[PDB]
Design a protein around this ligand. Structure first.
Ligand SMILES: *[C@@H]1O[C@H](CO)[C@@H](O)[C@H](O)[C@H]1NC(C)=O
Ligand SMILES: *[C@@H]1O[C@H](CO)[C@@H](O)[C@H](O)[C@H]1NC(C)=O
Ligand SMILES: *[C@@H]1O[C@H](CO)[C@@H](O)[C@H](O)[C@H]1NC(C)=O
Ligand SMILES: *[C@@H]1O[C@H](CO)[C@@H](O)[C@H](O)[C@H]1NC(C)=O
Ligand SMILES: *[C@@H]1O[C@H](CO)[C@@H](O)[C@H](O)[C@H]1NC(C)=O
Lengths: 50, 148, 98
């Protein structure tokens, strides 16, 4: 008979703060604010004086 | 957003709840994101009554008027971005209202392009109230519409 | 032991710049989120109407995100919709009987 169109939806998504809402259930996300560091001085390519 | 209609029983400006409150909540969210508090407390870095240092007062005034030109450019750009966005999200649910009407009356239809309607028949206000219910149906005399 | 006044000036400056960038970061992401959902909803229109301008003389419409037809054809039709390569002209003279 017919077709439909659509998109993709993950069953457990991420909530982002848009411009006119708070907590919008979005499929995917990234994280502009990196919280996890490497707790050492990554110093290859330099001569490094502790 | 609203409606207005013309038939044999009368006329008069209707209204609709669905996309109205959607429009008011998107700007209220746009309000409450922006109508909000800067949580950071800014201290008092320069004096008002006696004798701040000449160079660092010029540095602070260079810094503050930069930051003033930073935020006022931001405030002018933000509001003008949000104004253009608000008129974008005001004009958007014209399309979201007007075409979800046109994909229901569609086999009756020719079109004029005013923001309005046309028909093959004449029915009462049971039709036009159901347009605001999103609950219109057509299938019962398409076999007569080809005669029209 | 940083100096008391210029440390307050730097903290006035940094927390301003912190309030500059964090307002910018909150505004940017929320602008980009609204823009990403704008450029996610946009090619619904760019996909769904470029389908509707091809089946158009068969058509009435329901408005779900979907399709209707006058006939029944096999999967050679619906695979060609994804090829952007559908054609209609061969029995419009029978569609007026439908
Ligand atoms: C979402 O983005 C991440 C990148 O961190 C990627 O690994 C993943 O495949 C993407 N898609 C889904 C459905 O999670
Ligand atoms: C800094 O600017 C204010 C007004 O913007 C002025 O009253 C004050 O005298 C200025 N201070 C210096 C050191 O230029
Ligand atoms: C419209 O909605 C109201 C309440 O939601 C309902 O009572 C009514 O039957 C619906 N249909 C029409 C044609 O008014
Ligand atoms: C500046 O702020 C930091 C934390 O934001 C604080 O540890 C430091 O003591 C402050 N310095 C002065 C001079 O206020
Ligand atoms: C669709 O595209 C494929 C490859 O692009 C081609 O082999 C095929 O003939 C096209 N048409 C249909 C109806 O599948």
């Amino acid at each position: 008979d017919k077709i439909c169109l659509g998109h993709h939806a993950v069953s457990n998504g991420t909530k982002v703060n848009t411009l006119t809402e708070r907590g919008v259930e979005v499929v995917n996300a990234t994280e502009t604010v990196e919280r996890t560091n490497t707790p050492r001085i990554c110093s290859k390519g330099k001569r490094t004086v502790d | 957003y609203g409606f207005r209609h013309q038939n044999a029983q009368g006329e008069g400006t209707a209204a609709d709840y669905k996309s109205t409150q959607s429009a008011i909540d998107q700007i209220t969210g746009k309000l409450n994101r922006l109508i909000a508090k800067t949580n950071q407390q800014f201290k008092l870095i320069d004096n008002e009554f006696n004798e701040v240092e000449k160079q660092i007062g010029n540095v602070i005034n260079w810094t503050r008027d930069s930051i003033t030109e930073v935020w006022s450019y931001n405030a002018e750009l933000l509001v003008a971005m949000e104004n253009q966005h608000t008129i974008d999200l005001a004009d958007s649910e014209m399309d979201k209202l007007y075409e979800r009407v046109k994909r229901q009356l569609r086999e009756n239809a020719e079109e004029d392009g005013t923001g309005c309607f046309e028909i093959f028949h004449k029915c009462d206000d049971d039709c036009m109230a159901s347009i605001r219910n999103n609950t219109y149906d057509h299938r019962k005399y398409r076999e007569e519409a080809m005669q029209n």
